[PDB]
Design a protein around this ligand. Structure first.
Ligand code: ALF
Ligand SMILES: [Mg+2]
Length: 638
């Protein structure tokens, strides 16, 4: 059941019922009865909407279009009524195709958090709903479960994925507090090995977590609420037309009906100037305008779709050109989304190949996500992989150990060599690793036996086309540029430098992104382009929200107004460009579609009929539609 077929039947009936009687061999009950159907199908839907708004609201333009059909029907030139009814039904169907907004992400957002939780009660562990969790409760989050509440760890250690909140799927090691009575009072002193969030996914170990916020006051409950209260962005052209009808419809139907009904000064029959007022009124129904505005929208959206970007409506399509600022998530948006091997720093008498081969020999046995990067990139650099190690063992939260060439190998964080039996870390290599950590490198130190072979550094590299699209967007007038990421500030600064963004903010929560976005939106229109769950509120409050189409979360795709479906950034200088020209195509098509009405309707009070109205109105409608179709031609300029 879809209502577009009534406009199609009015098209078939107008055309074939204009053809059957005239320049045709068809009877007047079959050939002209089609024109009878052309009044019924297109008129009956606009009629019921007219009734719906005339119950309470003041006026509707459908009154003007429908009575413009009806007066031509009860008078001469019924092709005028059928034509106006057909083209206005079609312009209504085109606005309905431009009006499609699913705007629902609550279904995906509700899945991030569980409904129930295990809570400790002395010698028992009860099951309660999360809305019945009290602050100070100890919930038991066991293996690979979704965390049900914000708080801090009091028992157990585990590697937790905080992707829905930090945007980083890189697991973070979590340890219990030293003193929980102290930790509940001093929430500002919670180290990131301790702060846990609802919606995170637990790792291998169970965690007792003391609750901090209530069920609705958690960070993820806040991002749900913030997304739900999004302002539905309205296109500047459409609300302009709403206010314009609010003035134009009653003004014209008052000034050109009863003031033109049976005017005493010029000779008229009391029954025949009754036709004279409706000539002006019926032709005053500005149908060129009702068809110009949605056709440009649909053409621009179709060109964007063949260009590889989804646009959910005309309002973001119009907003993309007017932007002054744009903000970028890092991981998955400006970066590829995976750590590569980017720095090798040998030490002492160790070669580069010894360091890389011992690293790949151990990381072939590990299952941490960095092991796979190390193995594939040592295989890239050396062409080969050495023989794998023996006696793999984990030092939990710090790294790994193995045995290569009858010597004991330790790899991991700087805290590992502070914790195990062998030779301690020299200060110079310590400082080198410190320098790598500050430069945004996740850093592993490698010892083989008595000797430190050295250190190695991995990083999520930016996309190759990032710096290019950044410079292009600066050329197109976007001098307000920033990075806003949940990753730490070293990686944010290093990627922002490597891409060419001047201001980079890391360590941000989703609300902090919303804060930065509102601060930019105060000075102009702003776009938030990202790919994660924690970017969805900043997308929702921005002037236009854009999601990375392929790698992105379903939450961010359902929330965003623009989708970069090729998952590449080179679609952004194209998009804004199209948006600018689209406004030109509607602006021209606005004034024309208005002007000719304002040009043909005073001319209708001074000697014009209903017969020529189709000829002017079609001449006003088709041409503007034709200009909108120029939007189907545009260039990439690669
Ligand atoms: F991927 Al992000 F902040 F969520 F850089
Ligand atoms: Mg992300």
């Amino acid at each position: 059941r879809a209502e577009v077929i009534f406009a199609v039947l009015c098209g078939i009936c107008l055309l074939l019922g204009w053809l059957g009687p005239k320049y045709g061999i068809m009877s007047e009950q079959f050939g002209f009865g089609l024109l009878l159907a052309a009044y019924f199908f297109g008129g009956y839907f606009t009629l019921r909407e007219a009734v719906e708004k005339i119950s309470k609201g003041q006026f509707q333009i459908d009154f003007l279009m429908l009575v413009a059909a009806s007066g031509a029907a009860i008078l001469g030139e019924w092709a005028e009524g059928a034509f106006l009814l057909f083209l206005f039904s079609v312009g209504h169907a085109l606005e309905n195709y431009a009006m499609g907004r699913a705007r629902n992400a609550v279904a995906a957002l509700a899945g991030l958090t569980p409904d129930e939780a295990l809570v400790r009660r002395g010698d028992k562990t009860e099951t309660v709903l999360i809305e019945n969790l009290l602050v100070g409760d100890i919930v038991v989050v066991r293996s690979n479960e979704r965390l049900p509440a914000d708080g801090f760890v009091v028992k157990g250690s585990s590697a937790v994925n905080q992707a829905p909140i930090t945007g980083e799927s890189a697991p973070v090691d979590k340890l219990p507090v030293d003193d929980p009575e102290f930790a509940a009072a001093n929430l500002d002193k919670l180290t990131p090995q301790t702060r846990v969030f609802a919606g995170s996914i637990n790792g291998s170990g169970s965690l007792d977590v003391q609750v901090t916020k209530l069920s609705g006051e958690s960070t993820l409950a806040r991002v749900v609420t913030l997304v739900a209260e999004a302002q539905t962005r309205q296109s500047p052209t459409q609300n302009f037309t709403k206010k314009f009808e609010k003035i134009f419809v009653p003004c014209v139907i008052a000034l050109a009906f009863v003031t033109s009904f049976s005017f005493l000064i010029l000779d008229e029959t009391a029954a025949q100037s009754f036709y004279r007022a409706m000539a002006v009124l019926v032709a005053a129904s500005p149908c060129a305008l009702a068809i110009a505005t949605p056709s440009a929208v649909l053409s621009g959206v179709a060109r964007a779709a063949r260009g590889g970007v989804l646009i959910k409506g005309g309002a973001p399509l119009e907003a993309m050109g007017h932007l002054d600022a744009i903000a970028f998530d890092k991981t998955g948006t400006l970066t590829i989304g995976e750590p590569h091997l980017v720095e090798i720093t040998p030490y002492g008498d160790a070669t580069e190949t010894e360091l890389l081969q011992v690293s790949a020999a151990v990381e072939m046995l590990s299952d941490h996500p960095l092991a796979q990067a190390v193995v594939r990139d040592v295989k890239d650099r050396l062409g080969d992989l050495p023989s794998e190690a023996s006696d793999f063992a984990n030092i939990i939260g710090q790294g790994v150990s193995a045995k290569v060439d009858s010597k004991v190998v330790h790899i991991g964080k700087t805290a590992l060599f502070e914790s195990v039996a062998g030779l301690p870390l020299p200060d110079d290599l310590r400082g080198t690793v410190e320098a790598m950590s500050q430069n945004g490198r996740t850093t592993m130190i490698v010892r083989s036996g008595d000797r430190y072979l050295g250190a190695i550094g991995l990083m999520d590299t930016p996309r190759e086309d990032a710096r290019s699209v950044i410079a292009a967007l600066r050329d197109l007038g976007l001098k307000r540029m920033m990075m806003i990421s949940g990753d730490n500030q070293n990686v944010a600064n290093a990627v922002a430098k490597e891409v060419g963004l001047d201001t980079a903010f890391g360590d941000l929560m989703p609300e902090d992104k919303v804060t930065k976005i509102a601060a930019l939106k105060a000075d102009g229109g702003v776009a938030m382009v990202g790919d994660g769950v924690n970017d969805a509120p900043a997308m929702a409050n921005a002037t236009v929200g854009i999601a990375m189409g392929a790698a992105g979360s379903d939450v961010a795709l359902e929330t965003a107004d623009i989708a970069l479906m090729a998952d590449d950034l080179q679609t952004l200088p194209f998009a804004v460009g199209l948006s600018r020209k689209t406004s030109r195509i509607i602006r021209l098509n606005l004034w024309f579609s208005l002007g000719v009405v304002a040009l043909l309707i005073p001319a209708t009070l001074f000697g014009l009929g209903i017969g020529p109205a189709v000829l002017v109105h079609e001449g006003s409608t088709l041409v503007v539609v034709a200009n909108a179709l120029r939007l189907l031609a545009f260039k990439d300029n690669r």
